[PDB]
Design a protein around this ligand. Sequence first.
Ligand SMILES: [Cl-]
Ligand SMILES: [Cl-]
Ligand SMILES: [Cl-]
Ligand SMILES: [Cl-]
Ligand code: NA
Ligand code: NA
Ligand code: NA
Ligand code: NA
Ligand code: NA
Ligand code: NA
Ligand code: NA
Ligand code: NA
Length: 129
Amino acid sequence: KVFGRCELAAAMKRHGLDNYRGYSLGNWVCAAKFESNFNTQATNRNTDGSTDYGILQINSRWWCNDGRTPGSRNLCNIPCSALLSSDITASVNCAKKIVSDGNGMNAWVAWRNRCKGTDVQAWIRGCRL
Ligand SMILES: [Cl-]
Ligand SMILES: [Cl-]
Ligand SMILES: [Cl-]
Ligand SMILES: [Cl-]
Ligand code: NA
Ligand code: NA
Ligand code: NA
Ligand code: NA
Ligand code: NA
Ligand code: NA
Ligand code: NA
Ligand code: NA
């Protein structure tokens, strides 16, 4: 599923991401934008052999099981395929664990490089939330 901007903001809010660990909803939408362009089916292979899955490009090195990432963990206790669903629940629940891991949203390199310090509120501007 490719979400609309305000559509995703609404879903993220409904699943409790809005201000989760102090990160406003706009931070989350911005991260999703640059990670997956709002496409739940987005996958990308990493140089180390791990793969990133879903709207927030969650990495199989730590967070999910895909059966093909040697020496990895599955800290979210989910198959990486769950992160590709039209229903964002699994992505949100996993992202809450990731953002709690110590480095906050810096876990998402793209958030650091493209969202951090910017006017993230622009990402939810105009949305009925
Ligand atoms: Cl957009
Ligand atoms: Cl915001
Ligand atoms: Cl594996
Ligand atoms: Cl933080
Ligand atoms: Na699509
Ligand atoms: Na914070
Ligand atoms: Na993609
Ligand atoms: Na894909
Ligand atoms: Na992989
Ligand atoms: Na994801
Ligand atoms: Na997803
Ligand atoms: Na695994």
